[PDB]
Amino acid sequence: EKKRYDREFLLGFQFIFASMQKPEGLPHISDVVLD
């Protein structure tokens, strides 16, 4: 089974806590990676 998601499903996750944890290991790119 392929993992397919519609837009409403995806948008529902934008602001859950797991989606607000800053990713680890990001490069320092000024005004691109918001620190």
Binding site for another protein (CB under 8 A): 2-7, 9-11, 13-23, 25-27, 29, 31-34
Q: From the centroid of its chain, how far is CA 30?
A: 19
Scanning the structure block, which residue is given the tokens 């993992």? 3
Q: From the centroid of its chain, how far is CA 32?
A: 15
Q: How far is the CB of 28 from another protein (least distance, A)?
A: 10
Q: How far is the CB of 25 from another protein (least distance, A)?
A: 7
Q: From the centroid of its chain, how far is CA 26?
A: 13
Q: How far is the CB of 9 from another protein (least distance, A)?
A: 8
